[PDB]
């Protein structure tokens, strides 16, 4: 495997929100597009479901703090051996060494706003960006975000040493890679969403609780 | 596994309230939303029941100290071995080293207020945040809270070393992780609740004792 | 297991009142609510009976020194071994090291007051806090209290080392935990109660001796 | 295998965009032609599909930040051995040592522009560069780009040592090559695209989501 930013976001989600609903930003290219008020969409896969960013803030379709310093190091190792009566003896070791130090901050839209943003009419200037959104999938508004406030420098180091002897020959592979990445401030590390169901083109019906369809029209 | 904040809240609940009714805040992202007067809801699971924060203070639906310094270190270790006639010999060790030093303070709503907040009429401005709350689940008001007053820095260190030999091959995994987190002041570490049953839309019937239904309407 | 405050209260009750009737405060979050004049209620369990604090002082339902310095250290250890014909050999050791130094003071309501508080009429402003009290359980008034007068710092250290070999495999667990807590002044460490039976809504009948029902109405 | 620039672009895509849709620029000769607003075309192959740059910016057919410092080193090695009953024993080792340090920046066309660039009429001055584009293939607009901002110097080192004994004779080959390349600023390392479907010669229909045909005319 995963990006360094992926690992740091997974750690931040596992720590700053035990259970709950916060999901970790995957890619930092579109981290800026997961900021508060940015509309988000869902997509279904055979593995599961994921989120994408349309790049639309709420103002496009609207008619119109807390600082946590995480720091950790991780050392993991896993070795397996398999044997088969076909003279196939495989053995693989996978080790990892991670070091991260990050200082995140929390932002969130006040519940007063969500109280005001109830069943609002959209803009008559329907953008093709939104007008063409497939109604089969859902649509959400980003509510709360954990974003860095300092230039970070995260480090990882992976090692994959695995081989396998066959009845005829062998095959081995040894990889050792040290990786290091740098991050500017204000990169959203995690977010949570509130659904937006649209019975028609003037109903920004903000859905808080309940698995439902975001486009019943 | 658990968040560091989860562990420190579990320790604070086990110490500052032997037995009793106080429950420990799980995630520190929504710790600020478990402050006093913040409405809370229940949710049932196959494992049990848990609480969530609506983010509503009492003023939304209303018509209208003691300082404890805890410090501890924990060293635990557990090793198990299992054998099976199918040539399956597994063995796993799980160790943990925790160090915490925290200074919490207590706040609570005076019983005079709870005397005044009896069978109050709500606000005619029913927010969709509350209006859409599922009546199947319950609703509570946060009464007392233990909140930090100093920037804390908690440390943990886990180790999972477990392997298993099979009739054909083996499989091992060794993980060693040191973790450290920082916490700002005023983070609610634990809370207790008093129910609010609503026979109708103007009855904020505050329930002190008794397992009942919070929405008989 | 027990809270450190639980252990210190058990020691203070075992020392400052041999036999007698004083019961030890369990949780220090509601220690302040066990102060003198605070009404208390009973609750029955399959294990036995316990007390809770309503948070009501007598003034709510009324119409209208001695300093002991305890210091001790305790070192206990218990080791047991069990064998079974099913190839089950278990062995467990449980050790504890406690160190406490505390300076408590005694307060108590004079028997002149209890002489005056006989068969008093309550307040016509029946609070729902009291009005809804289940008449099946009892109701008491806190009479005497042992409360600290100095900021204390109590220490404990537990060790649980127990394992068990089975016919197939083994299972072991070793825990070592050092714990330390701090306490502000005026924390009630123990209390004793005098019952209040209510034949009607204007009879604060103060019961001194005799196991009876506190709500015959 | 691959060009050094190919390797650094693959690393930047794997890191700065986990999953997602960003594709890595392959050749740095035409990196400048993958800049924002530059039209791009697709081409299908038996292996898969790839992109080429027409060299056309949007202004040709229109009528009319974030800085990440990546640094890593990679050490990989793979050794295989094969035996055959025809007295053929081959063995090959392939090792690599990469060192890269790069500072990229992100640029992207604002969603306001994509809102404005909807179903635009093209220029009446149809260039033969575009007029002759085969309608079987697709056509896209480059939306976001990761481009270096500093003169970089990337290093690699490959080793291929493989031999094979046959029933009659042998055959061996050993190659060791250290390579180093330099890069000027503003070289686009990765890009993502938004399709442009043309039902006729005056319809710049900008397609966001959906695998379709970019020339239905």
From Swiss-Prot, chains A, B, C, D:
Changing residue 155 to A/E: Decreased ability to trigger pyroptosis. The record marks 75-76, 204-205, 213-214 as: Cleavage. Residues 1-217 are annotated as: Triggers pyroptosis. There is a cross-link at residues 161, 174, 176 ((Microbial infection) Glycyl lysine isopeptide (Lys-Gly) (interchain with G-Cter in ubiquitin)). The chain crosses the membrane at residues 67-85, 86-109, 151-167, 168-182. It is found in: Cell membrane. Changing residue 213 to A: Does not prevent cleavage by granzyme A (GZMA). Reduced ability to trigger pyroptosis. It is a multi-pass membrane protein. Changing residue 80 to D: Decreased interaction with S.flexneri IpaH7.8. Changing residue 158 to A/E: Decreased ability to trigger pyroptosis. Changing residue 81 to D: Decreased interaction with S.flexneri IpaH7.8. Does not affect ability to trigger pyroptosis. Changing residue 209 to A: Reduced ability to trigger pyroptosis. Pore-forming protein produced by cleavage by granzyme A (GZMA), which causes membrane permeabilization and pyroptosis in target cells of cytotoxic T and natural killer (NK) cells. Key downstream mediator of granzyme-mediated cell death: (1) granzyme A (GZMA), delivered to target cells from cytotoxic T- and NK-cells, (2) specifically cleaves Gasdermin-B to generate this form. After cleavage, moves to the plasma membrane, homooligomerizes within the membrane and forms pores of 10-15 nanometers (nm) of inner diameter, triggering pyroptosis. Homooligomer; homooligomeric ring-shaped pore complex containing 24-26 subunits when inserted in the membrane. This is Gasdermin-B, N-terminal. It comes from Homo sapiens (Human).
């Amino acid at each position: 495997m995963f990006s360094v930013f992926e690992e740091i976001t997974r750690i931040v989600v596992k720590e700053m929100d035990a259970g709950g609903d916060m999901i970790a930003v995957r890619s930092l290219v579109d981290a800026d597009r997961f900021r508060c008020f940015h509309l988000v969409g869902e997509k279904r896969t055979f593995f599961g479901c994921r989120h994408y960013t349309t790049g639309l803030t709420l103002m496009d379709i609207l008619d119109t703090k807390a600082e946590f310093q995480i720091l950790d190091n991780v050392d993991s190792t896993g070795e397996l051996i398999v044997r088969l009566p076909k003279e196939i003896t495989i053995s693989g070791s996978f080790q990892g060494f991670h070091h991260q130090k990050i200082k995140i901050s929390e932002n969130r839209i006040s519940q007063q706003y969500l109280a005001t943003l109830e069943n609002r009419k959209l803009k008559r200037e329907l953008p093709f960006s939104f007008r063409s959104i497939n109604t089969r999938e859902n649509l959400y508004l980003v509510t709360e975000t954990l974003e860095t406030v300092k230039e970070e420098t995260l480090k990882s180091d992976r090692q994959y040493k695995f081989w396998s002897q066959i009845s005829q020959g062998h095959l081995s592979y040894k990889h050792k890679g040290q990786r290091e990445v740098t991050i500017p401030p204000n990169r959203v590390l995690s977010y949570r969403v509130k659904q937006l169901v649209f019975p028609n083109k003037e109903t920004m019906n903000i859905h808080f609780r309940g698995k439902t369809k975001s486009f019943p029209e």
